[PDB]
Amino acid sequence: GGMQTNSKIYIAGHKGTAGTALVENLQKRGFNNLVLKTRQELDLVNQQAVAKFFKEEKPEYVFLTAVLPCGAANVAQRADFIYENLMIQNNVIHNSFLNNVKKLVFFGSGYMYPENAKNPLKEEYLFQGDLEYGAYSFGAAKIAGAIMCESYNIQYGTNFITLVLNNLYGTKANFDFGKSRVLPALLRKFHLAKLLSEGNITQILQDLKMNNFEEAKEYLHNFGISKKSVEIWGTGKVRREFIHSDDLADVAIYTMQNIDFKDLIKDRKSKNTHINIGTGIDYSIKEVALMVKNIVGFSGELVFNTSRPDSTMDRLMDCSKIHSLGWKHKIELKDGIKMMYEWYKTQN
């Protein structure tokens, strides 16, 4: 009946934001029989390496967090987003089946839903219109991962569950400036703005990768940071939903212990058995940036540059299905950002 304290657990991609929170929350709950492989010891795109790993380690449970993620900086990698994510998904999912994995959890993305779908997004809005253009191939790969899980559950009686989320953040998130995840990057930008407005050359230099402070200030300004203001592109009315990675780990563990494919099936032709996860509430980028600015204590202005349009669709999950299955989020956004900022300050 679900995971046991001695169950062998593989968290794929365990160094990422979701993966780190899954490791720490599993062991806080008493599950420490973990199998972990960094990218350098196991390239999940390589089918031979993945098949060898599953044959040797025989994990009983799998949390598949590894991804090549679509972001504003790397959007040109249209081919890589579909190839690499399809290969990770196929390799891990099929080899879990071959080696009699008990349950698996795969994480979907809100980019799998049509660009013009109604918010809040229901699980049955899959395939109801075209995907957003920049995330088109990434979203198609996420669709194929969700359909793969379901197709293995139907043909082979596996228990492979897809949980779909929008924006992740966490106590120990990826604040690196290249793969610019929305909430961690906003937090760091207001933190650097506060350090700049205080005249703190050293901690800026340490917090950045850099040794030339004039180069640092130019780098700050490219991201809208100034002594007396933070400027962000757009109207500020684009709306986003966020989930703290402790809540991500909480629902993923709850799914392992409680939600089986039979719990999701329709009366006949069962489809759309993926489950949305999230907090069910969204905020405008203006409301989020202001919450970060207050938590950080930056004294300067918040400015929205409406000359270059934000373009983006709103994304908010309808979480009524996971609620009915017995799980709801524990961390509200203001409390979650405060957790993230306290860890961030005690870091470098």
Minimal distance, residue 221 CB to a second copy, in Å: 28
Closest CA to 278 of 327, 222, 217, 236: 327
Question: Which of 36, 144, 210, 325 is close enough to bind a second copy by CB under 8 A?
Answer: 144
Residues in the chain after which the chain is broken, C→N over 2.5 Å:
none
| 13 marked ligand binding residue | yes
Read off the tokens for 41.
């010891």
In the region spanning residues 115 to 134, those forming contacts with a second copy, defined by CB under 8 A, are 126-131, 133
Give the number of residues in contact with a second copy, rule: CB under 8 A.
Answer: 43
Q: Three-class SS of residue 312?
A: coil
| 233 marked ligand binding residue | yes
| 343 marked ligand binding residue | no
**Cis upstream peptide for 114 (omega within 30°):** no
Which of a second copy, ligand NDP, none sits in contact with 136, Cβ below 5 to 8 A by type? a second copy
Question: Which of 16, 139, 300, 336 is close enough to bind ligand NDP by CB under 6 A?
Answer: 16
| 335 marked ligand binding residue | no
Q: For the chain, what is the radius of gyration of the CA atoms?
A: 21
138 is catalytic: yes
In the region spanning residues 27 to 46, those forming contacts with a second copy, defined by CB under 8 A, are 46
Strands 239-240, 283-284: pairing kind: antiparallel
- Per the CB < 8 A criterion, the answer to whether 234 and 246 are in contact is no
Please report whether residue 80 would count as binding a second copy according to CB under 8 A: yes
Please report whether residue 19 would count as binding ligand NDP according to CB under 6 A: yes
- Per the CB < 8 A criterion, the answer to whether 138 and 154 are in contact is no
- The residue (of 196 and 250) whose beta carbon lies closer to ligand NDP is 250
| 188 marked ligand binding residue | no
| 134 marked ligand binding residue | no
User: Cα–Cα distance between 262 and 100 in angstroms, integer?
Assistant: 18
Report the first-to-last Cα separation within the chain, whole angstroms: 43
The total number of residues written for the chain in this structure:
348
Please report whether residue 134 would count as binding ligand NDP according to CB under 6 A: no
In the region spanning residues 287 to 326, those forming contacts with a second copy, defined by CB under 8 A, are 309
Question: Which of 21, 35, 105, 141 is close enough to bind a second copy by CB under 8 A?
Answer: 141
Minimal distance, residue 108 CB to ligand NDP, in Å: 6
- Per the CB < 8 A criterion, the answer to whether 11 and 23 are in contact is yes
- Per the CB < 8 A criterion, the answer to whether 160 and 104 are in contact is yes
Please report whether residue 100 would count as binding a second copy according to CB under 8 A: no
| 2 marked ligand binding residue | no
Closest CA to 276 of 61, 69, 109, 158: 109
x/- letters, 96..115, toward ligand NDP (CB under 6 A): -----------xxx------
Please report whether residue 255 would count as binding ligand NDP according to CB under 6 A: no
Phi, psi of 258 (to 5 degrees): -135, -25
Please report whether residue 333 would count as binding ligand NDP according to CB under 6 A: no
Please report whether residue 82 would count as binding a second copy according to CB under 8 A: yes
- The residue (of 16 and 336) whose beta carbon lies closer to ligand NDP is 16
Read off the tokens for 295.
């938590």
Q: Which of 31, 54, 138, 175 is catalytic?
A: 138
> For 263, left (φ over 0), alpha (ψ -120 to 50), or beta?
alpha
Residues that bind ligand NDP (CB under 6 A): 13, 15-19, 39, 42-45, 65-69, 88, 107-109, 165-168, 174, 181
